């Protein structure tokens, strides 16, 4: 039951406002992951929604 959250493994500085900038340890709920290897995510730190690179996050066990 419930959801799986994801955590940033590394800092990332976005180059476009479509993408989130984030810091190691930030957590996200994934809004959509069905379109490719960048995923639409909702940061629990900033409340923002934007694309994140899937190789920079891992599921929180």
């Amino acid at each position: 039951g419930g959801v799986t959250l994801f955590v940033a493994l590394y800092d990332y500085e976005a180059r476009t406002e479509d993408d989130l900038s984030f810091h190691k340890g930030e957590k996200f709920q994934i809004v959509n992951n069905t379109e490719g290897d960048w995923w639409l995510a909702h940061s629990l730190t900033t409340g923002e929604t934007g694309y994140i690179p899937s190789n920079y996050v891992a599921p929180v066990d």
Binding site: Y10, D11, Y12, D18, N32, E35, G36, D37, W38, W39, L40, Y51, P53, S54, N55, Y56
Partner: peptide
Amino acid sequence: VSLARRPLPPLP
């Protein structure tokens, strides 16, 4: 490519 399908950044 759509936003989801752009190349990924290299790992640090």
